């Protein structure tokens, strides 16, 4: 991946400041609110009829964490995304049948959410390397659909 040191540096950097636990909920949550069609993947989550029902759902908050958890684990492995996400790709394709276009959606919703926690500090060049990273993570999760 086209990750220059600067970028990596800046990526890795901003990340240490991130409340893993609460950020992941923010995200899976906004995903569920902004692009409603995704909801068809978590019937098991109970109520999703209003935004408050989603943003506040504990089952959403927990899942969100796992997702951000795996993301983290991928930023500790930038030069080997495909592998890191190999097993998670299969599962995401073979067991749950998620059209990969949806990764791009979480990913950008993700960029929006960081943008919201850090304000001004989420400067353009920074966003830049975030998109390079969320793009990566999406291709690497998409990489074993067959």
């Amino acid at each position: 991946m086209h990750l220059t040191p600067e970028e990596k540096s800046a990526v890795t950097a901003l990340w240490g400041k991130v409340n893993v636990d609460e950020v992941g909920g923010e995200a899976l949550g906004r995903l569920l609110v902004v692009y409603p069609h995704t909801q068809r993947f978590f019937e098991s989550f109970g109520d999703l009829s209003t935004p408050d029902a989603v943003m506040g759902n504990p089952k959403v908050k927990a899942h969100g964490k796992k997702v951000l958890g795996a993301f983290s684990d991928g930023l500790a492995h930038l030069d080997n995304l495909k592998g890191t996400f190999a097993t998670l790709s299969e599962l995401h394709c073979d067991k749950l049948h998620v059209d990969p276009e949806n990764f791009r959606l979480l990913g950008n919703v993700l960029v929006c959410v960081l943008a919201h926690h850090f304000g001004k500090e989420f400067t353009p060049p920074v966003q830049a390397a975030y998109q390079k990273v969320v793009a990566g993570v999406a291709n690497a999760l998409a990489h074993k659909y067959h």
């Binding site: 906004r30 609110v33 902004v34 943008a115 919201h116 989420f122 060049p125 830049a128 998109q131």
Partner: protein, 141 residues
């Protein structure tokens, strides 16, 4: 299909925008050129440097076009028509670029309106944007 509530939110969020609109628009254009280099092929003639002045003013023009678009919520396809030919017909801008730019307007506003950008508003802005995007892209064939 934009909804009563969606509408109520675009307006309130566009209002806190206020006079940071232009500025916000420029920040957005800048965020786009920086994260999606392809988009700059539409601007081979612009000074695209960090802090550029050709930029600001264009952003300026973009945010106003959006304000107007809000002001004529119920008749966007007309209200924005002359901008439609501009992009469908002379400029000839491929749709994806509309998405990248909306993504940045979202990011930009996200970073400026901590407390206005709640989920339900976020849901309405992507929609509104989608809408202004559908109008500007529709005469493409």
């Amino acid at each position: 299909v934009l909804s009563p509530a969606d509408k109520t939110n675009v307006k309130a969020a566009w209002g806190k925008v206020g006079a940071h609109a232009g500025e916000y628009g420029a920040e957005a254009l800048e965020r786009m050129f920086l994260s999606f280099p392809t988009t700059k092929t539409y601007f081979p003639h612009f000074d695209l440097s960090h802090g550029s002045a050709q930029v600001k003013g264009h952003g300026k023009k973009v945010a106003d076009a959006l304000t107007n678009a809000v002001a004529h919520v119920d008749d966007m396809p007309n209200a924005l028509s002359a901008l439609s030919d501009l992009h469908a017909h002379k400029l000839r801008v491929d749709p994806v670029n509309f998405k990248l730019l909306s993504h940045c307007l979202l990011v930009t506003l996200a970073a400026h309106l901590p407390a206005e950008f709640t989920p339900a508003v976020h849901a309405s802005l992507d929609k509104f944007l989608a809408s202004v995007s559908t109008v500007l892209t529709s005469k493409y064939r």
